[PDB]
């Protein structure tokens, strides 16, 4: 298509609306109600441009550029006097009832309404009458509500209902008394409610966690990091001030996590600001805990390691690729083991074998929204990999999108799509041990034990292809349900099979692989997705290594007097008594970590590591994409005693002092080249991000905006002399504003979005080649492995039907978005959103042993009697006991494990 804006010719996509077409060319049009991810509604009447019918016209017509298609040969004007006067009048109308709240508002400096007020050139007030006011609700611990600042642009309701699928936020009221919120007080129960602080162009919904320790956007120091709370790896912008992490913002990635995060990633960051963190290397002498510097601890650890006879290593999925590799180089390959259990490791290796050998393409997070049918096997996606569930919601709405597109309705006309697609949607079949959060849009929900889920998967695979292993003993109504599922999946053009390691069974993943292979044999465009548990589970799986149980046996025997444990507390993957015995019998226990764990009361040496806010590294997401995260700030800037170093730096310096007795704080690119040369499978992280020699026309990349304030007074309480700027030898970013953050810079990593005149999160428009699409010059992150040219065979190991037996209560895992991740539940703000750990029983089992709701019932696991209160779960099957993984005293390793000694307390 061809457009002519203000007498200038441009080439745009013909299926885009006029607003996004003009925004992709760098032209400025004010807008409130339009969002690239939500569509167009024509509410705010702010995007007005004067459209002419042909080349030679003078009258024109004021049209909504968000509602006007960018067809071929479209003549429009933005800077016409009538259009500019109308836009200024719309801003003035929005400013009649707006409170005088900008200094005391958390959106000041980040406010879209402020930028659109300045850009339209409206600065003189003539409205002299009273301004309407509204009471403010309580929306929970994360979202702070201020309805006075609203402009009634309907972005919140559209996102929260059409996109996020939430049910407890809506628009009420009348002519000018519109109220956007819950019908009463209470917490927004949606798992993606945190995106309201960026969707809302004003200060109605604000980050209350940020609002507690509040600073302005120009005072923040940002870094482009990867979220460290689950396996999806949504790119984020941590921004700090005064040496503490202040706010996690969403960082645009057109391939993974474009405009939205989940609540766990956005608000699970309070563990960085904890006061009980290890900040120095600490060595215990008897009962005293003395503090060493870097060199003293390095020499002492080198001496004690050298006096030992054999050393073993225990990595973690919470650590980066480089840190686990540095540990592995410190101990040796043959003496290296992972920090996960044997069953967890076997499930992880099976998932990886399906991923990079099964020959079936695993899509990225954005590409999930294009599949025409979704089958989820066992994994509770909303509680573990929530953003994948959001993409599944988009893929379900794809059927209504296709039905609207059949009637020549454009993609941005979201109202017409929702009107045509009333309730018809793409098939979603979820299987879980209880009621999934996706059941509102699910075409079918299967509540059954995990063995029955795997049996269902193998039955689906046998109904798809005759060569799959059959399943005998299927009820006729369940068989009719398989007929429904196979009729949905066979007719689907892009079927999708999602499962995960959190399901806790090898046979579920095997059944998913068999269904995918049977779909592949029919020529379908089947995609397959494995969800992992932690941030770098795929990295630890790809690097391989022994399980934790071998390390525990090896330590409890006594062959090695020297163990290293990195970024682990060992209670999420092993029992507490066994870990305590293994770490008390061992005379030399080294632990490298950044959080105060339980095993530091009996560990020989503990080195204060650096978290993602203070360390660089590379992590692998569940899809298989290496992503490089950077350091946000230097802890030594605000306190010189703070020795918080990178974990791979710690281990590399210790190995250097072990061999050559020389302290070596290496660079990150040396470790990158080490993992490329040593590991051919991890060779793909070389081009995940460019090295520290990368320059945009000679200058580095700036971590903070150009209006960074308080430079000569933020440290004046300690000393009036300004210290040296912290040199970043590790990467291409500088720890100051002496750098480059231009939207047109030839780079992929972007710390923060800021254009002149665009201070809002809408400044991400200038950083993309087309708005709502990919990032300009490509998106950061590269695929480690490609699609294989053959695949795996059908797995014959069909499990038997679950048998409810007395005494042996099989534990059904009930993961949560708040309370199933280690670092997330370490945060103090999550403690109010975190529900009480409630043990869930069937009505039949509770009647059998004599339980009503709320009574405290105790069970013994590994000789430890813990007491939890009972909630009656209807969707759970009899013979199972639902337990929340990750709570206080409960481990995620208990998924799929039977439980003994259950009577009422």
């Amino acid at each position: 298509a061809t457009i002519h804006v203000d007498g200038k010719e441009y080439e745009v996509n013909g299926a885009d609306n006029l607003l996004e077409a003009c925004l992709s060319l760098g032209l400025d049009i004010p807008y409130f109600c339009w969002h690239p991810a939500l569509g167009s509604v024509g509410a705010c009447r702010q995007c007005a441009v004067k459209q002419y019918q042909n080349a030679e016209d003078t009258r024109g017509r004021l049209v909504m550029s968000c509602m006007t298609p960018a067809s071929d040969g479209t003549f429009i004007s933005i800077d016409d006097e009538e259009a500019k006067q109308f836009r200024e009048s719309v801003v003035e109308w929005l400013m009649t009832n707006h409170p005088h709240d900008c200094p005391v508002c958390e959106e000041g400096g980040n406010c879209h309404l402020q930028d659109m007020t300045v850009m339209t050139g409206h600065s003189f007030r003539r409205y002299r009458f009273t301004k309407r006011t509204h009471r403010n609700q309580d929306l929970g611990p994360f979202i702070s509500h201020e309805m006075n600042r609203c402009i009634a642009c309907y972005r919140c309701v559209r996102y929260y209902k059409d996109y996020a699928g939430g049910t407890d936020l809506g628009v009420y009221g009348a002519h000018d008394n519109v109220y956007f919120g819950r019908p009463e007080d209470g917490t927004l129960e949606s798992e993606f409610s945190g995106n309201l602080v960026e969707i809302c162009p004003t200060g109605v919904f604000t980050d209350k966690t940020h609002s507690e320790r509040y600073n302005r956007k120009w005072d923040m120091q940002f870094a482009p990091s990867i979220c460290q709370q689950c396996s999806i790896g949504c790119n984020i912008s941590p921004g700090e001030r005064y040496g503490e992490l202040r706010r996690i913002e969403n960082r645009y990635n057109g391939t993974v996590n474009h405009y939205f995060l989940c609540d766990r990633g956005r608000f699970g960051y309070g563990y960085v600001n904890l006061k009980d963190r290890p900040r120095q290397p600490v060595q215990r002498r008897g009962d005293d805990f003395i503090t060493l510097n870097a060199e003293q601890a390095m020499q002492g650890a080198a001496d004690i390691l050298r006096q030992s006879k054999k050393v073993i290593g225990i990595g973690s999925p919470r650590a980066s690729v480089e840190s686990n590799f540095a540990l592995r180089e410190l101990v040796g390959e043959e003496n290296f083991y992972t920090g996960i259990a044997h069953g967890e490791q076997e499930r992880l290796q099976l998932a990886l074998k399906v991923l990079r050998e099964g020959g079936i393409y695993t899509p990225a997070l954005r590409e999930i929204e294009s599949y025409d049918a979704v089958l989820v096997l066992g994994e509770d996606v909303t509680q573990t990999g929530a953003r994948v569930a959001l993409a599944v919601r988009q893929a379900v709405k794809g059927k209504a999108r296709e039905m609207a597109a059949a009637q020549k309705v454009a993609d941005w006309q979201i109202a017409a799509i929702l009107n045509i697609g009333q309730r018809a949607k793409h098939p979603l079949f979820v299987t879980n041990v209880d009621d999934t959060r996706l059941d509102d849009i699910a075409a079918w929900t299967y509540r059954a034990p995990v063995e029955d889920q795997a049996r269902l998967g193998f039955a689906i695979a046998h109904a798809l292809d005759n060569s799959a292993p059959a399943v005998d003993g299927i009820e006729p109504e369940l068989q009719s349900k398989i007929d429904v599922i196979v009729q949905a999946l066979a007719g689907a053009k892009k079927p999708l099979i999602i499962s995960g390691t959190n399901a806790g069974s090898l046979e579920v993943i095997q059944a998913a692989a068999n269904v995918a292979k049977a779909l592949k044999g029919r020529g379908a465009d089947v995609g397959i997705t494995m969800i992992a548990r932690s941030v770098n589970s795929m990295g630890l799986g790809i690097m391989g290594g022994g399980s934790l149980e071998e390390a525990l046996t090896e330590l409890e025997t006594g062959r090695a007097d020297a163990v290293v444990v990195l970024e682990n507390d060992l209670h999420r993957h092993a029992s507490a008594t066994r870990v305590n015995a293994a770490l008390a019998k061992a005379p030399l226990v080294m632990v490298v970590d950044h959080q105060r764990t339980a095993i530091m009361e009996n560990a020989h040496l503990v080195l204060s590591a650096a978290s993602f806010a203070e360390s660089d590294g590379t992590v692998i997401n569940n899809e298989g994409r290496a992503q490089r995260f950077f350091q946000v700030y230097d802890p030594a800037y605000y306190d010189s005693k703070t020795v918080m170093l990178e974990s791979w730096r710690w281990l590399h310096s210790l190995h250097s002092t072990l061999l050559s007795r020389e302290v070596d704080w290496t660079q990150l690119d040396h470790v990158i080249d080490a993992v490329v040369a040593k590991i051919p499978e991890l060779a793909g992280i070389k081009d995940a991000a460019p090295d520290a020699t990368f320059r945009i026309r000679g200058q580095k990349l700036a971590r903070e905006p150009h209006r960074y304030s308080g430079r000569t007074a933020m440290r004046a309480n300690i000393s009036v002399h300004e210290p040296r700027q912290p040199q970043d030898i590790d990467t291409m970013f500088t720890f100051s504003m002496e750098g480059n953050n231009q939207p047109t810079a030839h780079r992929s990593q972007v710390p923060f979005a800021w254009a002149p005149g665009w201070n809002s999160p809408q400044a991400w428009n200038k950083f993309q080649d087309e708005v709502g699409g990919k990032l300009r010059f490509g998106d950061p992150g590269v695929r480690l492995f490609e699609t294989s040219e053959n695949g795996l065979d059908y797995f014959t190991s069909v499990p038997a039907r679950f048998q409810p037996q007395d005494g042996k209560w099989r534990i059904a895992p009930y993961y949560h978005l708040f309370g199933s991740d280690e670092l997330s539940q370490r945060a103090p703000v999550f403690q109010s959103r975190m529900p009480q750990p409630y043990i869930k029983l069937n009505p039949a089992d509770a009647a059998k042993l004599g339980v009503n709701a709320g009574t405290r019932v105790s069970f013994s696991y590994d000789g430890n009697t813990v007491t939890l209160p009972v909630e009656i779960a209807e969707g759970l099957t009899a013979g199972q006991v639902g337990l929340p993984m990750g709570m206080s005293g409960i481990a995620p390793v208990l998924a799929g494990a039977h439980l003994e000694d259950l009577k009422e307390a």
Partner: protein, 589 residues
């Protein structure tokens, strides 16, 4: 037609002459808000175009400016030739009362330009500064060494890939440079400074004037080669007052850079604030009301009287009389009382704003202005009678370091040094600005020879004319706003900020991020207290300045210093330094 509109200046005759001579493909005309025709010219034809401009019927006799620019970061270069660096030449034709800009584009690797010192002898220091600050080599230059930074300075500071803030301090480097200073005074080599005849006559003694200097000009060095008392040759050594004001212009917003504009010439104050805020108003498209113009003229004339009083008193003290410096500083205290009442500060008020001034005039300023205008003229006549008519002062000052109009034009000397040659070129009358047309004042001119005494008497007459302007301003003050009605007026009026929310939004985004100037180029040239000051500003569309170029006249005067003092005495050099009216902040900056 607004006076800030983006004109192309294709109706200029000089574009027609250039197209007739070099053809219509050899150059590209760039439309700017600078008010001058900007012509992008191929590097190979630079000397030909310069000689052609010098050989016009009304030639471009003066090289006003010459400096580089790093265009690697400039995103908005629509219509501009493909460049990694650029070198601009600002040439003023006095006879046409016009000026042209020539921009030579440069690749990242081939950073060499033909020298311009053959056509214009004052191009030497500008090319040395361009080589020092940008790393651009000039082929054919006699002595291409650093002029703003010491010779052992790695990198080039005005490049975009150079860090602006202060680096780590080290006393070891201090001791190393102390050692360099100590062996420089003992093992001086008059060869790297471009001097010849290194005491070849067995009597050419070598003297160092600075770097410590017990006067208000500031710290600077002159290395004199002497035959008895005659100055055979002298090499000025400047850079001892370099604050990096342009690099700070690349680091501050349009609002917060005004205090840095104050300290360019610290005897000027509001006169220094005026061209910068006028150029930013050109960039923002702001036309200030009449009351703003009269207020800014009032403060600029007051600071001009202050600077002229300090200059006359310091010259008289350099001759040898002592009492007039005490009396003139009492008069400066009267001026400072009025300025303290108006703004709230003495030396650097920081009171002008983009689109107006900071506050309004206080209730009762006319009484203080009337008191000052009654206090001045009797004391000024007393100063003339007591010191400026003394025949010992006349013998010291008359005929010392004299030059004609050709030497003033070829060295770029402006102000009293140009008007003592009889060239009636004042910016306030030739290219008027800020409502100077509404006032009636005379422009004093000399007989045609620039003595020290002639320059001092011209500054005395300029003081009297500034008193006349202040009398006219006191008798005629318009009633109106002290800030414009433009949305880019930074800051907005305070009471509307305190009780309106749109004004609060404008204030919030203008004091925090800065005002967003649309991407253009502006240039303002005014007559400062010591000559011609000018700000050339390039905006890339951001809230900071992509390029801030500050042309100051004491640079050209200090470059003219060896041309007029050769063959004279050292006391004549002292009197000449006292009569230039320069400060080292104005030279180095």
């Amino acid at each position: 037609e607004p006076a800030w509109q983006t004109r192309d200046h294709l109706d200029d005759p000089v574009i027609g002459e250039l197209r007739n001579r070099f053809g219509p493909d050899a150059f590209t005309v760039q439309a700017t808000r600078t008010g001058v025709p900007v012509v992008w010219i191929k590097r190979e034809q630079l000397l030909e175009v310069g000689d052609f401009l010098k050989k016009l019927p009304k030639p471009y006799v003066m090289l006003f400016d010459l400096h580089g620019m790093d265009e690697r970061l400039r995103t908005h270069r629509e219509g501009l030739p493909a460049a990694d660096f650029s070198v601009f030449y600002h040439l003023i034709s006095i006879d046409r009362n016009r000026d042209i800009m020539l921009k030579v584009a440069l690749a990242e690797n081939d950073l060499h330009v033909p020298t311009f010192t053959k056509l214009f002898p004052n191009a030497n220091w500008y090319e040395r500064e361009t080589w020092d600050l940008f790393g651009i080599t000039f082929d054919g230059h006699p002595n291409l060494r650093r002029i703003m930074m010491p010779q052992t300075w790695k990198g080039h500071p005005l490049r975009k890939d150079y860090p602006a803030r202060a680096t780590e301090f080290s006393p070891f480097e201090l001791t190393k440079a102390k050692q360099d200073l100590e062996m420089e005074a003992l093992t001086f080599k008059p060869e790297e400074w471009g001097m010849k005849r290194g005491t070849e006559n067995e009597d050419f003694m070598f003297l160092n004037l600075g770097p410590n200097h017990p006067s208000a000009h500031g710290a600077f060095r002159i290395v004199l080669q002497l035959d008895g008392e005659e100055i055979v040759d002298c090499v000025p050594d400047i850079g001892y007052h370099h604050r990096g004001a342009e690099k700070m212009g690349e680091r501050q917003s349009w609002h917060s850079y005004i205090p840095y504009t104050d300290r360019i010439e610290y005897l000027g104050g509001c006169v220094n604030e005026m061209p910068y805020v006028l150029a930013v108003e050109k960039l923002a498209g702001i036309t200030v009301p009449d009351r703003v113009n009269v207020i800014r003229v009032m403060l600029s004339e007051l600071f001009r009287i202050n600077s002229h009083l300090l200059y006359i008193s310091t010259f008289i003290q350099d001759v040898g009389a002592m009492t007039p410096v005490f009396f003139a500083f009492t008069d400066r205290q009267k001026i400072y009382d009025l300025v303290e009442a108006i703004t709230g500060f003495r030396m650097h008020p920081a009171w002008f704003r983009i689109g107006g001034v900071a506050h309004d005039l206080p209730r009762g300023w006319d009484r203080l202005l009337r008191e000052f205008l009654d206090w001045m003229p009797k004391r000024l006549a007393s100063y003339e009678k007591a010191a400026l008519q003394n025949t010992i002062l006349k013998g010291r000052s008359q005929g010392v370091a004299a030059y004609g109009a050709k030497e003033a034009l070829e060295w770029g000397t402006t102000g009293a040094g140009l008007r003592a040659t009889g060239i009636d070129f004042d910016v306030r009358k030739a290219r008027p600005y800020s409502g100077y047309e509404n006032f009636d004042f005379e422009i004093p001119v000399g007989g045609g020879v620039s003595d020290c005494y002639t320059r001092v008497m011209l500054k005395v007459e300029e003081l009297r004319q500034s008193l006349r302007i202040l009398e006219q301003c006191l008798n005629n003050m318009p009633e109106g706003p002290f800030k414009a009605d433009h949305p880019l007026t930074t800051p907005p009026p305070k009471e509307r900020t305190l009780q309106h929310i749109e004004t609060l939004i404008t204030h919030f985004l203008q004091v925090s991020w800065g005002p967003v100037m649309p991407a253009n180029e502006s240039f303002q040239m005014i007559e400062a207290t010591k000559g011609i000051n000018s700000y050339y500003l390039t905006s890339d569309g951001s809230t900071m300045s992509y390029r801030t170029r500050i042309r100051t006249p004491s640079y050209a005067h200090l470059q003219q210093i060896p041309a007029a003092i050769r063959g004279s005495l050292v006391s004549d050099l002292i009197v000449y330094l006292g009569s230039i009216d320069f400060v080292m902040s104005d030279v180095d900056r």
